[PDB]
Amino acid sequence: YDIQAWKKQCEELLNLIFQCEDSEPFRQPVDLLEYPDYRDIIDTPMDFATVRETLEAGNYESPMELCKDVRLIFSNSKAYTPSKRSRIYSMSLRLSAFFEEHISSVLSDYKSALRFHKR
Numbered sequence: 001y002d003i004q005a006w007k008k009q010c011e012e013l014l015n016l017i018f019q020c021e022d023s024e025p026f027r028q029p030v031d032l033l034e035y036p037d038y039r040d041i042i043d044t045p046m047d048f049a050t051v052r053e054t055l056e057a058g059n060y061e062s063p064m065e066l067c068k069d070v071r072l073i074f075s076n077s078k079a080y081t082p083s084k085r086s087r088i089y090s091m092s093l094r095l096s097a098f099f100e101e102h103i104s105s106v107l108s109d110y111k112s113a114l115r116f117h118k119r
């Protein structure tokens with residue numbers, strides 16, 4: 001029932017994501033010279049280094065907020081892809097499955113801790 005435990009759990013999961021080869025394109029911002037139409041399609045850029053910095057700054061209140069930003073990484077890749085068969089999109093999809101498999105217990109434990117706190 002540790003209301004703060006999500007934060008280190010999210011740090012460790014980001015560490016796992018950074019070790020995954022599938023995270024390569026999503027570790028830093030899209031260079032808008034190699035992909036100059038990017039901001040015509042994507043309103044809100046997001047990458048894993050921005051997620052990790054936000055977490056480390058103390059600017060997430062909850063793991064739900066971190067989860068929203070990580071899902072934005074994936075939705076941006078789906079919106080920008082020219083094909084459902086693209087190399088970066090297909091990595092986006094496997095990384096998403098990995099992230100959702102690992103974040104489910106972090107969210108569940110947080111929300112249970114906050115329910116216990118307010119019991």
Ligand SMILES: COc1ccc(NC(=O)N2CCN(C(=O)c3ccco3)CC2)cc1
Nearest residue numbers: 025028029030031077080081082086088089
């Ligand atoms: C400095 O080194 C960097 C920094 C960032 C990157 N990332 C990068 O260019 N991206 C291309 C667009 N994108 C897609 O989701 C996507 C779907 C289909 C095609 O692209 C996100 C990833 C690469 C090298």
